Each structure stands twice: as structure tokens, then as C-alpha cells.
Design a protein around this ligand. Sequence first.
Ligand SMILES: Nc1ncnc2c1ncn2[C@@H]1O[C@H](COP(=O)(O)OP(=O)(O)OP(=O)(O)O)[C@@H](O)[C@H]1O
Ligand SMILES: Nc1ncnc2c1ncn2[C@@H]1O[C@H](COP(=O)(O)OP(=O)(O)OP(=O)(O)O)[C@@H](O)[C@H]1O
Ligand SMILES: [Mg+2]
Ligand SMILES: [Mg+2]
Ligand SMILES: [Zn+2]
Ligand SMILES: [Zn+2]
Lengths: 591, 580
Amino acid sequence: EVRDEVAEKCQKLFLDFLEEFQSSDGEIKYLQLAEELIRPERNTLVVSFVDLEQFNQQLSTTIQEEFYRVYPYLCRALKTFVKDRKEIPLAKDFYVAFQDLPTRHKIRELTSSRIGLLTRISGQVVRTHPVHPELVSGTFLCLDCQTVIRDVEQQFKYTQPNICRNPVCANRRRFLLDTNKSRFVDFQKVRIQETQAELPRGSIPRSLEVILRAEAVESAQAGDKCDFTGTLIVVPDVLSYRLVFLACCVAPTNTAESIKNQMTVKEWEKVFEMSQDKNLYHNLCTSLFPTIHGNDEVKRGVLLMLFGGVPKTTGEGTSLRGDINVCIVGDPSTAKSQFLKHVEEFSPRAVYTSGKASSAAGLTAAVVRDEESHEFVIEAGALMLADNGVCCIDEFDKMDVRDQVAIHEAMEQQTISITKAGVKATLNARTSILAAANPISGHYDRSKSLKQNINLSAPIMSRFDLFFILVDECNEVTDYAIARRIVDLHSRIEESIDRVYSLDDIRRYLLFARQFKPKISKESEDFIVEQYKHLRQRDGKSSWRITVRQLESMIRLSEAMARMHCCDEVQPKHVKEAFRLLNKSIIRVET
Amino acid sequence: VIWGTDVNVAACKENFQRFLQRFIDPLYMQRLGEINVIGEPFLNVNCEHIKSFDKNLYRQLISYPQEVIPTFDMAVNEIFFDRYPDSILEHQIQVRPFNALKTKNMRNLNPEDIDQLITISGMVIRTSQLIPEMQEAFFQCQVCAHTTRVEMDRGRIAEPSVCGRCHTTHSMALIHNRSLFSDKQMIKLQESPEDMPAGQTPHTVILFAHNDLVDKVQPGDRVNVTGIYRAVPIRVNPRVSNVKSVYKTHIDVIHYRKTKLFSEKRVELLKELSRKPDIYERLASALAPSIYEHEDIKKGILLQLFGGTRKDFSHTGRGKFRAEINILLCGDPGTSKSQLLQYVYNLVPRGQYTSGKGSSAVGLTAYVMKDRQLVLQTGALVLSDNGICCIDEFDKMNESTRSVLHEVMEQQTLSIAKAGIICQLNARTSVLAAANPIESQWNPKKTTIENIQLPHTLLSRFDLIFLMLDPQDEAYDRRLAHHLVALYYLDMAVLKDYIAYAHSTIMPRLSEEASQALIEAYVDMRKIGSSVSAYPRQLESLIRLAEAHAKVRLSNKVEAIDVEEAKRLHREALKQSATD
Ligand SMILES: Nc1ncnc2c1ncn2[C@@H]1O[C@H](COP(=O)(O)OP(=O)(O)OP(=O)(O)O)[C@@H](O)[C@H]1O
Ligand SMILES: Nc1ncnc2c1ncn2[C@@H]1O[C@H](COP(=O)(O)OP(=O)(O)OP(=O)(O)O)[C@@H](O)[C@H]1O
Ligand SMILES: [Mg+2]
Ligand SMILES: [Mg+2]
Ligand SMILES: [Zn+2]
Ligand SMILES: [Zn+2]
């Protein structure tokens, strides 16, 4: 029988914000959001933090400070706001989902001081637990006096009633639970970690467990990067405590016009120059690969892989790949790891790893019992971490059979559906893959077919867009030049590189170029058709034959080379160069 | 003065505030301005500065750190309210003194130092998640919802056991989120191993970073920590208030110092003997005197001890470089491989010795284990992150461990998917692997790969492969036996200082002479291979070897003499490993 006047005041002003504040048009937007919220499977009401700050800056600041304290009142005010407005079902739970908070903290910044107060954060999911109903308002009854101890809220643990509702009786130990009357809500535990950008080099990220409820339960998935609004809270555990961030709302982690406007004038001028820059193709490869001699076709193909073609979803709902898959087979040494390392070093979203990696994830999503809870959890592997990114996998020859089939499923589908021990889930992974392998017996037998040269299954061969063969040539000139490049790098400790375009400028151009979706000119369409006629007419003998899969790579490559110049339509120049790369990539059996 | 102390609040404050303003290497005022710019509200201070300025205040500081530090903050804040008198800070400046009394004999620590500041060098082993510890507990009556608070109830919490409004029976239950908490990180740290004379039982301690200075030291980092030694009782049972007569002890950290040499006579001495033309040979012969007739092996490990020059290719986008030298010693049992590893590990600083078998006492891997907190226990390679790990019986290993070895050799880091998160523990170590032949002896006409059955890839990552055997030559047995019987009936310390000085000061760097000599050597090897050919990893070995030889010469610039010796020694391993 005690009322928090701050909470009463916050509830009233928040209810006033619901029922008076309005859009630029002058209509109560939140009435419309509530109007849409009346549907089934709709209980979380979105709210803009900046809007209620404008309505009452004190209300927003007080809510920010005492978010956990005031949040039940917000739901109650939402219930009053929504119940009378329409024929909402009399009692279904309702929640308030916040957003528009500028105070985005790193995981390093979380402290006991930040308990209860609202905050926004961003990180990468690691493992996702199954959904589980959790009691919120426990309904109990002492066995002796049989008075219903109603609505004992449990602080995230089996908190029985302290004492009987009957003052006369003090059984204190035999409160039986009412299953139906106790209020429940579904919670899902998820692990997140610091994103690589915020993460200092060589520093272990601050792993964090979070709780997901209402529409947030399935909002994010395993291995994805997302931004979360909510607050940190202690949780007692076996006076011990541990921290968990309850996120009311979950959002993903971050158009050409918006980028170009947001892009500064100097960045715009440079990118504008870069788009105008002819021969950016070779110039970018040289800048991207300073400590490399020769093998520029590999540098060419990787750059196209960095850009990638436009994905397409058919009217039947069938997704068509936008990115691509490229593999390298090379003799011992020969810079394949160096190629992958440079790609990983330059590119965010580019993750390095090895096929020898003995992790239980196996580079991909995995279902594993919790080390403590013993429940199975969908733990994301590095491939899922590279969603909409790149994976620089090493030892691709030396993969495992389990990873091999799962990877084959992934590249075939662009997604992985994982099911075991009753638990089931699916995850999107549109990730360019850079396979690094060595020939069987170490050295590449050009006289033998590629199937003989590598252990990879034919489906792996089919689903890879390109294959580059590196061989230790006895030609001293290349050997001398490589030594010259290496020794100059070592002697000229820095400054040996020749970056005609800075890596940030390179990355900025790729980002802006990625905003474009080049289309196929009917000229280019017949040109592409004409190219495949030559390839079909060529008919290898090639180490591998020529199916429609080759054409699919060709069009995706042409889209990437259309993306190279940021042109909204494809031209024959892109097609012929794409044909040049792939046709040169076809290594004939040298027997 | 406050009771039991020679401490006056004002006089000590003025003495401290005098030290802040008046000082000779005034830097404290400069970093104050840097703090006023940056806003970092801490002032880390070498306590020896206070000793030099005022030994009594330093003595007063050591005796009463807890009592005296709040005065020091008060003095500094008023100074901040004097210079840049108006400013904005989430909280005013603080002070974290350090480097006061190097009682680094942690294994020799007495209860006389209780509640007195001490600084110690050691390596953190284990850590944990930050513990949110209550400082004020929010409470509220169950019956009538009458809220309330209890603030800092002497560690424990005093249950109200009665409401305030209705004054019913025990109904005021704590409210977790409404309560007030502070961060507290627990850390377990081991005594610095080289500082332990006997080392029969290395000493271990606990640490507590309270509300701040949390997670600033990752596990395995060798740092100098300075904090208040503390002892607390332990209840015989939590239910009962009885306590033990003994007192478990811990440190409340105040400052973390992440981590000249000797007198001038030593730098004179090493520079003197370095001028000797055969110092490279003399050190090799001087090194491992217990061994006989092996010099190429001795020279190779010596270059490994000196190691290649530190290189930073981060600007080039090429990532870290394996500046360290990894030598695999392959030879018959009884050929003194184990003795050499023990000799090198004994001499070398921050080294490690382990066995290729999984039954090694240490284990060459890190993994999580319940304390019952699931905490990461490190590995020998990570333990010798910069030092040298002498691995005996390297041939017999688990393939997963070999996979781990391939990663760290390739990357100088170890990637572990602890729980779900992945951590890349940097290990820029130097590997001294010792392998014995399969079967009793070495069968000729079988390669090292045939004779050891290991991945050609992994051994290719080894820069030097020293093949040593036991010839059927009674003369060598005769001379060796006479050498041993003579042993039956230069000091290492000067050598260790030489290598330490070279690492501390010298940094080899390529000469165009060495550059062209290396290029000629590699293409010559390629032409030899044009007819097991050359590989650019071999060039990486040769340049790294040349850096070590230049480091041996203390030139600070790689010279063609380094290339020639590197080419010679590289060819020796080729000749030793050459087989038809
Ligand atoms: N064609 C080349 N041009 C320039 N440098 C080269 C070339 N080939 C090899 N190198 C150099 O070789 C050095 C060693 O090669 P690296 O360790 O990268 O090989 P790798 O591709 O990982 O080998 P593998 O996987 O077959 O064991 C690299 O530093 C790179 O500088
Ligand atoms: N060339 C040598 N010069 C000096 N001492 C030698 C030589 N060869 C063998 N010895 C001596 O032989 C003994 C070999 O012991 P040790 O355990 O070190 O051998 P090992 O070859 O490393 O053995 P294993 O491979 O079986 O572990 C030691 O006394 C070592 O001093
Ligand atoms: Mg490699
Ligand atoms: Mg031995
Ligand atoms: Zn009762
Ligand atoms: Zn009451």
C-alpha cells in the first residue's frame, strides 16, 4: 500500500506522452502503433526516446535513470492506453520497446553504476539458448492456512513466499504453487561479445549474457551482429551476483544517396574520383597487395570477390547468390596464407580461420549442451560470424568431413538448417568464402586433372566460382623479383608498400559501390550469351567441364565488375574481362 | 595526529601538495594538464619520487597507505581546482602510487607488512568476471510495500526483520536492482618465476580490483602490481560468527605497471668482449660446455637465444612476423638432446620446458576448468609468450596439439573458443623442439619425415632441422669419453646479460650488402633446386638468421657476414637433412 510518486508521475506523463504526443503531421502515431498492436502476436509497443524527451525532457531523463523501476508502470500505462482504445483481448501482456537512444556504450563501459538505468549497446551474438517460459508473478498458497499468497514476484530465482498471507499462521515453509494463476513470460538466454571494431587487438572480448522476451525472443539469431536497447541488471547465483543485460528492443548493427550525403566532401570527392578513375582495377590490386609479386589474376579475382555480384530473389521466393566463392590451390609457401591475411587485415567482416580448426563449432553453427545448464545451445561458428561478410578459411584441403558436408550445404543454400536433439533452427549466411588449399602430394600435377590434384568433393568444386593454381616455377626472374620484393619490404621496414589508394578510401569506395545494384543491359545479356557460346564451343581439355554453374559465376562476376565502376548497368567491357578471368582460370590438363 | 599514526591531515596534505608542485626529474603539473585535457581522473605516481623528495612522507605513505591516500586525492583535487579551476569531470582526480618497495621476494613476505603498501613483480594466472558487490541494499516490506534502504552494513546486510510503516513481522526483503552495487574483480597471480631463488614451491596470491582498474590485466601478463596487503578472518561456518586464528590474506590493488640494466661495468664488459673476432665462436664453445664436438647445433641455438630482430609489418598490412627462431633437434636417443634443452631452459630467462607427450606435467595447451567458476588455465606456449619453450620428445604428440603447434608457429598466437567466445592469445615464442627417431635407431635412406612420421608442412615451418646421430667411430667415442672423464673431476651469467642487453638495446636492420647477399643466396639455392628446392620461407629463415648473427655481433645493422654465416649454417642443416 505504498506508491512511488515518481513512478506515478512518470506513469501519468508517459501516459500523457502516449495520448497527446504526435507526429509532424499532428496525429498520435503511438495510437496508430497501438492500433497495429491489437493484432495477435503483437504486444511490444515501439517508442522513440527522443520523442518523449521532447514531450518532457525530465520524463525521459528520469526514465533513463530509473528505467527498471519505472518500466512496469510504462506497461501498465500502455495497458490503460490500449485497452480502452480498441477491443484488445482483456489480458494479454504488453511491453514498451525503446529506441533512438544516442548513448551507445561498449561492453567495456558496463558497470554496477549502469544497473537499472537504460542504455544502448552493440555486439555480436555467440550462442542462443532455447526459449523457456519463466514465471514473473508467482501465485502461492501456504499448505496450513490455505491463504493464497498471490503475485509473489520472483527475482529470477525460485523465491518462495517469505511468510503466510494469513498473519495468524506462520508455516513459512509449505507454500504450494498455483500453476495456472502465476503469471509467466518467455525468456531466452543469449550470449553476445564485443564486436571486432571495438575490440582491442589481442584482447579477450567481454562476453555478456542477455535475456530476450516478447517479440525480442526471436528477433536476433546466432552469430549475427545487432544493437540492443535496455538496461543491465544483477542476478543472484550459486550474496553472489552476476550481470545480464535485459534488452527491450533488438536492432541490427547499422542507400547510396544517404551514404553519399553522410559521406564527407573530401571522402565524396575521393570516392567520386575513384568511380571516375579508369584502370582502378589494376591500380587497386597493386595498392591492395603491396607485398606481392605476380599472380595478379589472384589479386583480380579476390577484388571481384570483395565486390561481389548483386543477389536476386525470384518471384518464386528462390534466392540467387550475390556474393561468390573462390578457392586457391598452391604449392608449399606461395603466399596463399599471405593472401588471406591481407584480405582479413584490410576488410572488416573478414574472418580468418583454418580447416584444421578443432572447435566444436566446426566453423559453423553447432548444437551443444551448456557446460553448466546442460541444455543444448545453438553456438554460432565463425562462418555465421561472417554473415554478409567474408571467411578466409585456411587448410581447406584439410577440412573435416562434418565441416565439409555442412559447408557444402551452406554454400549450396547460402543458409544452414541445423537440427539435433529435438532442437531445430535455420540461419542465413551470405558469406564470400576464400578457400586456401595445397595440391595432393604438396605439388600441383598440371598433367593430372584438378580432381586428382585436390581431395575436395565434386559438389565443392561445382559450387566454387573460381580456382587459381599456383606453381613453383623454376624461372629465376620471378624468383629474383620475389626476393627483391621481400628484401625491400624487410630492409625498407615501412614505405615499401605502394598504396595508390588508401585502404580506408578503398573500403569507403567498396561500401559506396556496394550501395549500387548494377543491371544487365540487353547488349550485355547477348554479350554474356555470346561469351558462354565461346566457352561451350571451347568445351575445355579442361580439368573440369563447363555446366550452367560456370555461367552463373560469369553473371555474378560481371555484376561485381559493374559494381567496380559503380555503373547502374552492365557493359560489354565488364563481361569480356569477366570472361577473360574465368577462361584464363580454366587450366587445361597438361598431360 | 589520528590515533596510532604519525599522520597529520593538513601537514601531510601540504607536504604532498608541495611535492606535486615542487619537483625535479614538475611533471605532475604537466600530466595534470594532460588529465585536464583528457579527463582521465587518475594520477599514477612513482613512489620513489616521493622517497627522493621526502623519505619521511614515503615512509609515512608505506606505513599508512589507506589513511594517507584520501589526503593525497584531496591535495590533488584542490590543485585541479586551482589550475583549470573550472572544468567538467564525472569525478575528480585520483592517485594510484606505485614502485615503492620492491619486496619482490613474494615467497618471503611477513605479517609485518599488513596494511602497508607493497609492490611486486609477477604473472597473472587466472581472473574472473567482475563481481557486483552491494554497498547499499534497497529493501521493501512485503505486506504494505513500504520501501527503505540499508547503506553499507559492514559487509554483511542487516535484515530489518520488521516493517517501517505497518511494523509487521519480517517482511522487508531486499530489492536487487534498486540496491546499490560496485564492481569488484578477483584475480589470482603467481610469483615471478625468475625472481624465485629455489623455486621449490612457487608462491601464489590473490588480488581484488575494487570498483575501478578492472580487466586492465589479461591472464598471463607479467606486470608489477602495487597495492595494499590485507588479511581478513574466515568464519568457521557461515552460520556461526566464530572465526579462525589464522588469516587468509589478499591484496587490494592500487596500481598496475605493465611489463636501466645492471651497472655500467656490464655494458662495458659485453661491449669489450663483443669486439673479439671469435666471440661468436667463443660463446658457442662456451655455451653448453657439458656437450662435446657439437658446434653447429650450439651456434643455431645461440642464434635462437638472440632471436631475429623485432619487426612490425602492421603498416604494410602484412600482419605480425615470426621474428622468433624455431629449431627442431632430431637425433638418436642418448645424443644429449634432452640435456641441451635442460641447459638452455635453465640458462634462458622466462623460458619453459615441457614434453611432447600429453603426459607432460604442464601440458602444451590452455583450457577452461571450474575453480567452481569455469576459468581459463593457460598453456606452456602462452606461458612462454615471449620466452623459449624447450619441448622434449616433440615427435610423440597428439595431432590436435600438432594443429595447435602449426597455428602458433604460423601466427604467433593461439586461438581458443572458450565457452563460445574466441580468444587469440598472442604467443611470439621461440620453439626448441627435440625429436627422437622412430624405432631404436635412425635407419638411413629414410627421410626425417619417414624417420619421424610428422607433417611435412609443420616441419617445413621449422627454420632449422639439426640432424644429429651417433657415428660408429670409436675415436669420437674415445675423445668424448676422455672429455667426460675430464669433466668428472666463461660463466653463464655474463652470457645471459649479453643476450639481455642485445634484446634490450640492439635491433638488427638490413644493409644493402646483406640485402644483395641474401638475394644471391636464395636464387643460388633456387638454381640448386632448379635441378627439395628453395622456398621463400627459407629466405625468411635466412634473413632471421642474419638478424640473430648481427645481434650476436651487436652491430645493430645486418651485415653480409651475417648472410654468409646464415647461408653456411642453413646449408649445414640442409647437409645434415640431405638424404638420398
Ligand atoms: N609470388 C610471390 N610474390 C611475393 N612474395 C611471395 C610470393 N610467393 C611467396 N612469397 C612470400 O613467401 C613468404 C612465405 O609464404 P607464406 O608463408 O605466406 O606461404 P603460404 O601460402 O602460407 O604457404 P603454404 O600454405 O603452401 O604452406 C610470404 O611472406 C610471401 O612474402
Ligand atoms: N656429443 C656429445 N657430447 C657430449 N655429451 C654427449 C654427447 N652425446 C651424448 N652425450 C652425453 O650422453 C648423455 C645423453 O643424455 P640425454 O638424456 O641428454 O640424451 P638424449 O640423446 O637427449 O636422449 P633421449 O632422446 O633418449 O631423450 C648425456 O650424458 C650427454 O652428456
Ligand atoms: Mg599457409
Ligand atoms: Mg633426451
Ligand atoms: Zn500459513
Ligand atoms: Zn509494511
